[PDB]
Amino acid sequence: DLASLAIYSFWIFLAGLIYYLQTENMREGYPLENEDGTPAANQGPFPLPKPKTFILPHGRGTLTVPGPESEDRPIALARTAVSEGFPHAPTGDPMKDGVGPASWVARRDLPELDGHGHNKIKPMKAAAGFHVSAGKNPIGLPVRGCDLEIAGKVVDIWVDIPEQMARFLEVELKDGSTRLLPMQMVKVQSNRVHVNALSSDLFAGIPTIKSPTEVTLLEEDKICGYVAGGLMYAAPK
Amino acid sequence: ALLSFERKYRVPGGTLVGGNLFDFWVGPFYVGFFGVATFFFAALGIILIAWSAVLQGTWNPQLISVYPPALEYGLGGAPLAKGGLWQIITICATGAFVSWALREVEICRKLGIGYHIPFAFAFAILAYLTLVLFRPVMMGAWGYAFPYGIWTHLDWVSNTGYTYGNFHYNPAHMIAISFFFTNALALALHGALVLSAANPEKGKEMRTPDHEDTFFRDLVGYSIGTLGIHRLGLLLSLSAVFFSALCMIITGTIWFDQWVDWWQWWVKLPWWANIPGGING
Amino acid sequence: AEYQNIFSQVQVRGPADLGMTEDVNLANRSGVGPFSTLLGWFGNAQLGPIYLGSLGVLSLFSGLMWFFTIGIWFWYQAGWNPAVFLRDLFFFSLEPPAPEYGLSFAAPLKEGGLWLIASFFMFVAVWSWWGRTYLRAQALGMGKHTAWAFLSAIWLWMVLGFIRPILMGSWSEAVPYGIFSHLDWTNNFSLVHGNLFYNPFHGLSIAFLYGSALLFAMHGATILAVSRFGGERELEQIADRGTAAERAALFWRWTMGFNATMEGIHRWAIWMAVLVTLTGGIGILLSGTVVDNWYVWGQNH
Ligand code: BCL
Ligand code: BCL
Ligand code: BCL
Ligand SMILES: CC[C@H]1c2cc3[nH]c4c(c3C)C(=O)[C@H](C(=O)OC)c4c3nc(cc4[nH]c(cc(n2)[C@@H]1C)c(C(C)=O)c4C)[C@@H](C)[C@@H]3CCC(=O)OC/C=C(\C)CCC[C@H](C)CCC[C@H](C)CCCC(C)C
Ligand SMILES: CCNc1nc(NC(C)(C)C)nc(SC)n1
Ligand SMILES: [Cl-]
Ligand SMILES: [Fe+2]
């Protein structure tokens, strides 16, 4: 019967679609590894997808996935156990070393570009026309950690130009240098900006930006990662 | 085994209960206290389904159905065979879902991300609890709840619906469907858009977010943006399930008639209600 | 408490983006509209510009003629009475021809001919718009994923209004133009066909509709949870994996044993949603033409 043929045919199609979808979702992270870094014997029942290639805009080269995969950075961690399935403990300061919830990825040390090739993220002071249009303006307000002490004052907002949104708060410390705090890790209030993640003394630990009018994808990961890592690692204060 | 980038994230910490006792993985799966709790509740609920199946005299998953107690039991416990197995399986289901959620929270803490996912999964849980717990309690009996079987639960939806005429007329059911339909529409569009920028026309460089914005501006005169759309998808899906729960918690508790009667608050209103013409006059 | 990134704390307005030129003909691009502070709390504030080419205006004009045809018939059912119009707005219905007329365009205006005229305008309006989702993408150098997923919706629509009624031999099998009437048609359709719950394609369509709400709740939550590492910027994560992508995947790998990638999840998304209308179209198309009674058919096969 024709409905029987339709339904049975669809289940064949759906198993084929799932298979394709799961291999499409193996273009990063695979092949799986043992805990010592070497390739694992068991890789699951779905095969590695055969490579594809994205041509990146603005002369940025090309990404091939899947392909040669490394962390290309030191991982300060040590095995907790002989067998598999156990945690790996930080050998050092996990916040400054970039592990666990303080982790970052070795992304390209260049800034994200919009469609006309200019920097995507710029401080509002170097962004002709940009102003706070609604809600509380945080510029000039004290920045307060979770030990309730003042780490500094907000001196600017770094905006995603194409999307028109506030991404970071540039904060001046005791010593006069500045750091970027992601906007989704702050609570702007009528008389201060509160950062639950970090205590005041730990803001200097936030990695710094090389150039003062641009931020690279590598620096953003280092920054974002370090701040969110504070939720675990600064917590005992 | 591990993903190539996973090792650096497999640190101790994040647990709410048990300290470091259950702080480990089985293969890919994180365990935690709530992983052993999930397993205990899921193990026990599955064993009780299989017991219900030996009692029903079938192994066919198409036919296995665990019915809740008859209405005459009210909110009392019932003997295993006559609704007691449903009651225990429901308790086990509830403890598994809540434990799964709390386990997601532990996983969130270890990875230092927001708690948006378990907060969201909680709406599904509340919808389940509406059909299985809240509505039955307000209505006076566990028997008003749905039976656990692949086809028998559909018949429950049919019988419950047709108790109130066409259930389409439930105004909160209309809002929920609107949110469901709009959700799938939105998911299709977002999935397409990202894919259309990442996988552009042959002989073209990968597109930027500006292209995504420009496409939705050209087509519709408005782009909600990358943050906005993921906000929107979350809002739509959650709203759909919230108005699902709402439309059921009011059915048979503060509303008892055919749902089509609701709409007379508009038709039979005194001033235009008499006027000759139209459909209802 | 902890900031959730559902609504923005501080909005920021700047020079409006006029957008990417690429191969777009700027002659058909309108001026920039104003900013909405209300929309800005949730998404972008900028309104417009919009593109309105030869195909977009055809679509707008046919879509309006559809609305003005349904509307002129609703007024006539009301006896030209504005009070009666508002009261019974949801109860008015432009019904198709009765079965006696079969697939003929020869029905008088007042008994289904106006339905055929409405259907013509809606047919031109949808297909004009579909060509438009295609052309907008082409001009920007993008993939045609939006057009191909849109065909899935058009397919369900085409079956309800056109392909099913034609194989059934009468326009009377099509869906009437009314708020409440289209719901009643939906209920009769299931009753007539021996309970649509037992149509396996209806049950698939449900699995995908429910599954679309599941998947968007998952992905929306996921991205908001990693927006603190710039996770909403999905294209740069595809080109250059960031810790946002990595944490997202590990959240799910640890939770359910397997995960997606930043690109890959959007493939899960487009298929989950597309399979709603794809399966649904098939299931409706098979009702009446091949299977009279789904419950009965189910108990044998
Ligand atoms: C004749 C039947 C009636 C009717 C009677 C009813 C009744 C009765 C109900 C609905 C409900 C719903 N109806 Mg109706 N409905 C009708 C026609 C329609 C039409 C239509 C096209 O005409 C539409 C679009 C809908 C749409 C809907 C939805 C809005 C809603 C179900 C979603 C939901 O609640 O999710 C909620 C999600 C859940 C409950 C899922 C819970 C998930 C849990 C937490 C996790 C499970 C984990 C699992 C065990 C693990 C598996 C393990 C491994 C994977 C192996 N109905 C007709 C008119 N409808 C229901 C509703 O709103 O209920 C709240 C409801 O009770
Ligand atoms: C929401 C309103 C009604 C309802 C109305 C309908 C209607 C109408 C339909 C379904 C259908 C289904 N419903 Mg239901 N369903 C309800 C509540 C539930 C609950 C619950 C505990 O709350 C569960 C687990 C299910 C599960 C299911 C699936 C068996 C089936 C496909 C849905 C799907 O893929 O969703 C999306 C989810 C995913 C894509 C994730 C995967 C979920 C997997 C596939 C579910 C496996 C369930 C498994 C057999 C449960 C046993 C677990 C073991 C004991 C370990 N329903 C409530 C009571 N349900 C469809 C069907 O074909 O029924 C036969 C269908 O047409
Ligand atoms: C008593 C009634 C029956 C029933 C009878 C039917 C019938 C009949 C049908 C469904 C259909 C569906 N039912 Mg049902 N359904 C019932 C109970 C349920 C229940 C439940 C009890 O929980 C659920 C979850 C569902 C769920 C579903 C969906 C999975 C499916 C609709 C998918 C869709 O996306 O359509 C919405 C999307 C569209 C209709 C696409 C149309 C898009 C067009 C092209 C856009 C035009 C826009 C227009 C120009 C104007 C607006 C534009 C503005 C300018 C913005 N049904 C009951 C049992 N159901 C449909 C299906 O596919 O079934 C196989 C269908 O035909
Ligand atoms: C609220 C918006 C939508 C939503 C969101 C959502 N669902 C979610 C999540 C989110 C955010 C998760 O994080 C979580 C997840 O991990 O998914 C991958 C989940 C989830 N949604 C799931 C299912 C599900 N969600 C559904 C719906 C929705 N989920 C909503 C539409 C539906 C339906 C019917 O529409 C289903 C079937 C699971 C895949 C997963 C939760 C997995 C879980 O809880 O695991 C622990 C429990 C077990 C392993 C088994 C428990 C066994 C029980 C003791 C026995 C079964 C009893 C049951 C009551 C009988 C059912 C018989 C039926 C035939 C009626
Ligand atoms: C870059 C995000 N742009 C965007 N914009 C819009 N606009 C509406 C209002 C149609 C949802 N949608 C998407 S996907 C739905 N993405
Ligand atoms: Cl056009
Ligand atoms: Fe996304």
CSV table of C-alpha atoms in Angstrom, one decimal, chain C residues 21 38 49 53 57 85-86 141 152 164 200 204 230 239 249 295 297:
chain,number,residue,atom,x,y,z
C,21,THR,CA,26.0,46.4,-1.1
C,38,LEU,CA,11.3,49.5,23.1
C,49,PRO,CA,15.8,49.9,5.4
C,53,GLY,CA,11.8,45.4,-6.1
C,57,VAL,CA,5.6,44.9,-5.0
C,85,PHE,CA,-18.4,43.6,11.4
C,86,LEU,CA,-16.5,43.9,14.6
C,141,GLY,CA,26.0,36.1,-2.3
C,152,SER,CA,8.6,23.2,3.0
C,164,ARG,CA,-5.3,17.7,-2.2
C,200,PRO,CA,2.0,8.3,11.3
C,204,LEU,CA,6.1,12.7,12.9
C,230,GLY,CA,30.8,36.2,22.8
C,239,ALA,CA,35.6,30.2,11.3
C,249,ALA,CA,29.5,21.4,23.3
C,295,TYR,CA,-7.1,4.4,12.9
C,297,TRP,CA,-5.4,1.6,8.5
